[PDB]
Amino acid sequence: PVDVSVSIFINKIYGVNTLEQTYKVDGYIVAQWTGKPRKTPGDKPLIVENTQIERWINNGLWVPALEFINVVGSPDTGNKRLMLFPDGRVIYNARFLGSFSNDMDFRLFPFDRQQFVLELEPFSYNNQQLRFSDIQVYTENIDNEEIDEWWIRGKASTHISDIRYDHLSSVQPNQNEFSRITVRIDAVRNYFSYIPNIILPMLFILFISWTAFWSTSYEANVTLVVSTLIAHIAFNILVETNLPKTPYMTYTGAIIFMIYLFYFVAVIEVTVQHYLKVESQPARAASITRASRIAFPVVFLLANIILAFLFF
Amino acid sequence: PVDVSVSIFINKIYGVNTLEQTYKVDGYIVAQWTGKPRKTPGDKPLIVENTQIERWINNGLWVPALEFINVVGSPDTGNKRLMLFPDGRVIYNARFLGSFSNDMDFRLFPFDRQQFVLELEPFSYNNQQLRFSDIQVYTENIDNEEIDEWWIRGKASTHISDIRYDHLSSVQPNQNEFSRITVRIDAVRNYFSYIPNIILPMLFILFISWTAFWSTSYEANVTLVVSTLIAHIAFNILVETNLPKTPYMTYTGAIIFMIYLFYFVAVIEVTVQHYLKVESQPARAASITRASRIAFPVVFLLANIILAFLFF
Amino acid sequence: PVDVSVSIFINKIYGVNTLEQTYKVDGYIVAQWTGKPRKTPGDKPLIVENTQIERWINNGLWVPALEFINVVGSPDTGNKRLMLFPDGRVIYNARFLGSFSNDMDFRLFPFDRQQFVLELEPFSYNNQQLRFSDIQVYTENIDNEEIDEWWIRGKASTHISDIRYDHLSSVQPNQNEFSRITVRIDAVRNYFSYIPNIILPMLFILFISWTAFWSTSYEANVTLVVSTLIAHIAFNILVETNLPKTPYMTYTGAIIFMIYLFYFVAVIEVTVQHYLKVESQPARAASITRASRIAFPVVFLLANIILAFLFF
Amino acid sequence: PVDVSVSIFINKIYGVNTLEQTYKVDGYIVAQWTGKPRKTPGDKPLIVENTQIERWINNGLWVPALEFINVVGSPDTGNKRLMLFPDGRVIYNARFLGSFSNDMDFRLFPFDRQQFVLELEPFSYNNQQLRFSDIQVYTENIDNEEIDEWWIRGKASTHISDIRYDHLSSVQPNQNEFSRITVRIDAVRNYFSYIPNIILPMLFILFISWTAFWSTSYEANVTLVVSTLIAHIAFNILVETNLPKTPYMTYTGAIIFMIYLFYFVAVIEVTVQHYLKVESQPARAASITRASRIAFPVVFLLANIILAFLFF
Amino acid sequence: PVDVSVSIFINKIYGVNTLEQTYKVDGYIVAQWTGKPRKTPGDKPLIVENTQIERWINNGLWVPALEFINVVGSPDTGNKRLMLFPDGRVIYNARFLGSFSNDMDFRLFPFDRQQFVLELEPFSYNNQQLRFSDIQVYTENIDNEEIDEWWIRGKASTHISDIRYDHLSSVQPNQNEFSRITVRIDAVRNYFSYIPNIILPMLFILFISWTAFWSTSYEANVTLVVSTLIAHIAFNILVETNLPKTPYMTYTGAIIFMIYLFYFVAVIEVTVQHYLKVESQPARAASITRASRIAFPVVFLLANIILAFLFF
């Protein structure tokens, strides 16, 4: 079992896709493994570059196949460098930029909780142990909390585990166990701009519909409730890109669907106020309007607390 | 006929395109075929990596051309590994991520039924049999049914068949028969979020138009039916991306087109109610409104059941 | 002149761009040319794969440069295979997926007529004849006419021609003549879904504006004609992607522009009806409304027949 | 100084970006330079293909670095061919498809004037003269003037110049002068479809707002001017993609901004007409409406002529 | 320590992304380092091209790994050229086009201040000094200030620094110091078109809502304030692409959110004016309207000055 020291540097974690549950990660990968003693020109260790790296393997130099398990497509390896030491050890430094998949829960978008995971397992070698994992997410979080989309919390989670496989070759009494690095950086999305850009204006439009709970004129009432619903849909179109859309139900989506009913229900109230006045019963219509004038804001507050009580 | 054992691992089936009938599939491909006996360093079998794989073929090592028949463009092969055994057999392990085409029926979108097919046939060898196919879709479906867009039902369908060709070379008395793997995983789209985000709000807007079947004021009636049609088109704009658009007629599209008539027809009713009152015949207008107040909801229910009876 | 037998298989003709006049074509290319006699291991012909193909050319093996003339960018060649026969002939099989340019006429979109052309000419060899062209568009059209976007009509058009060039080198007394394959598959776009999704709803919105030709209330009339124009523009936004937009005038675009006038003209009528009633002359306004109530539908029908008479 | 004959063929000039001032150009590049005498098999000149081209340079064959100066990114070179003559000269034929940058003036979009420039200078050789430039834009313009987006005027502009550099090496008494080809094809955008699709309907919506200069009812007046402004913004959304948006002010943008004022000003007029009638002074309101009924169309005509007088 | 003279030419700084804080930079890179004396054919220095550059490294020629630190993905290197001098020095000229990341502050968009930074550090060599940095942004700024999106101010900022690292190898306590080039060009976004296209029309729509501070009719008042809010959201949809959206609060976003309240508040005023007239207290409603007729424009002016006082 060849011991490999893996040190991964983290520079950027950008472009979090709300559909494919993908995110682009940039940095550097360092693999210091003890090889076999070789002769370098003099005492100083040899420095080999990307083009000449393949030339060394042809001559009889070992290079282990360390592949990312959760990588979506082939990641972009910039410049790769092999540092052959006269003593024996070899240091492999390579810049990488690729897409990584991890199960994401967007259920509670306004106060999002997400984990960015990176996994590495040698593609061809099982009885070749991975010594120690090191995550250097030295890109300062408290430096620009407003500028950074995600508030980096904790200097990642180091985890080294032996992944057991089932479907393999004929000889597996102790070949099914592959060493695997499990890097997991945590982050919390900043609500800072999501309230005065999405939440707050989507609420005002809904309360503007509620101004028909004072107005007696049905012609003016229709214009309020119908047009605000147009404004709500229009504003939901503007937002949509910022909004995360997943196959499951969300707290934001639950509120968004709840708003659609509170328009439909208000339309009913306004129409009820009208038909009562038409059928010479305005005494009911008078109290019906006064009721919903206090009921609607209370009911929406109860239900928003109900949703929050279920999601949190 | 060289016997080839093909074991394909399935990791992800993501990004289902509603137009091109394409979907991205990620995993691993294993090809264990009995070659010719060779000498490996000692007893242990030789492990060859991607860069050195081409070097072996030049020396005189066999590598069969196993191409995906239904692959759209050249798929992304990550790291490929050849395992040369001293006895004779060779195990080929390669990570793949590519686009696959299959005939899809989106006719019934809210309760979608789809099959994800993967086909493999040796590009150059016909009298080279494919021994056994194995599909390892071990990515747990019941684990996160709400999170997964498609509910993976069944551990795929293994199918090995001899595909017969017509247009070939000169020598074809028994060369037209190529061995082909036919992998078909089944899945059902979760309706869970499609009802409170698309179906339900598209219905409320249509019923808000129906509130003119109580109102006597034509000026207020126009504002209802005309503006709700604006809201419906606006909401159809928001949805559109989620909506699958194909060259054939769909259950969703049939309902969507039916809604467009139920606005146009309601406009007619409202205008009829007006001209009758204008031409001193309000007795008809009074019953005309009361009729459509019960008729419209019944007619739409009948027709929605009619459509459902035709599609299902 | 080396005789080359070219047989092109057609699998898919997908993604027809309405702006760049491009379409993606997938299939296989077969080039059977009589080379020089060589010795294969035994009697059986040698099978050479993509990586080893370049190795043969270095040793002294001929490979002709067959490039697509109408290809947009470098097309994606999947797996290429050379079949060296002991007698002399060589069969070249290669999978291709690329973009092809051809002059397209979208003038009559609802009942579209289009030709998909593919051209092949040897990039370097003029006095090297192309024997016979064969198009195998065996992807069944009548199988799924509703599912297929284009109804494949005819098993393509085989055409072999000697293309004469003007601007060449110094030596051209008989070097300007290059052999060229001209493959042209015909197809007709299915109107099936384009009427109940685009045409029909765009018409209803326009007739809803015409309901002001019965209404006497100007305040209610404005709401009709102005808001329907908003709905028309809104619906044209939804459609737009499905709609083909070219630098020339189309039948669809002519109707679309005609609809914009029929709103503007109706606004004038409604305003005329008003000013006449204001200036104590409602006798004119009464007949003015009754006139346009019969005129507008007749005029639009005449003009739609006029447009159809010009385009067809 | 090695004399190089450069003949560039033009096939397509497609996808003109209104932001980055980029356009994709496809064709062929021919470089006939007199090298050194070599022995070809017999008398016939040797034909070398793309893969074997690099093999010749290794043996000791010259290939000059002819790079496009105005190319955005590395352009797509399809198939490249070297024609080695026994006498000495070498003809280099290569198919290219790349993006080219040139300063574009979109100030007057409806009647656009644009120049498509292509520049070539040897990347490594200064005292290596470029003999003669030849542009073969034989893709017929008058063939399909309605189908072609740009009306190709003139068979391009041939220009060969010695570009002088300042920041170079140590030895520059006569090494700063590089030979450069300056190809410039001219074209004029067809207005044909831009008037009945963009200009004309954007005008009708603005005149529909002007129908409030006859109407006495403020409630009906508001519905006109407010909703037409919604329609104008909605129609500007539909158009936007066709509209060129640059960091400077345009004739189209000036008119577009002018339209936004003519709505705001009309709103003021309508509100003035109201407050005058409210404050028992309708004599002013009567003439105020009659004034703007003649003023607004005259003022907009004056200002549109003013803008046209400034831009042209 | 090998002294390297780095001279970077700047051609284009295009496509500034408001989300990822990225921008594409094109130009040339010159690296003149004193190598070892070699024999060139005669006295003239050897000119080596891109394909032959790798051939020289195999023979025993030094090429230092100069990588961009702030580069997003692998940048596009066009044609690279090595100029081997007989004396010893080697000049490396390479054309580049890549994406660069730098922390951007969009807080004050209408009068934006931005810095475009480019960093270069040898990927493999620390005790290999970078002699002098030279930035040639000779692409004239005052030439076309209206055409250029960013007004290039200053001929960049030359900065050479020794970057100290923490996580490294065993070999040296004085190996953590890498020489790094820090190029920073400054630019200011032109407001020229952002006022008559975004700011000015977004203001007119808001003042059109204020015309209800004269109107006594609630039915006409609702139509004003509700529809202008639709127009504002509609216009914000049109703009959105031009608008920079970041996770922090902006001056534009603050004004944009402030506008959403000024609609909601105006709705309240209009509804208050109504309920007062309903509950036989129009004396209050009369002064309430007259108050907000002077208050609203003054309050918005105060608050806009307040925001400007905080951001500037």
From Swiss-Prot, chains A, B, C, D, E:
Primary location: membrane
Keywords: Cell inner membrane, Cell membrane, Ion channel, Ion transport, Ligand-gated ion channel, Membrane, Receptor, Transmembrane, Transmembrane helix, Transport
GO cellular component annotations of the record: plasma membrane
Cys-loop, short sequence motif: residues: 105-113
Superkingdom in the source lineage: Bacteria
Periplasmic side: 1-190
Cellular compartment(s): Cell inner membrane
Topology with respect to the bilayer: Multi-pass membrane protein
Molecular function per GO: extracellular ligand-gated monoatomic ion channel activity; identical protein binding; transmembrane signaling receptor activity
Biological function: Mediates cation-selective currents but does not discriminate between different monovalent cations.
Family indicated by similarity: Belongs to the ligand-gated ion channel (TC 1.A.9) family.
Subunit text: Homopentamer.
Protein name: Cys-loop ligand-gated ion channel
Organism: Dickeya chrysanthemi (Pectobacterium chrysanthemi)
Portion held of the full protein: 11 to 199 of 321
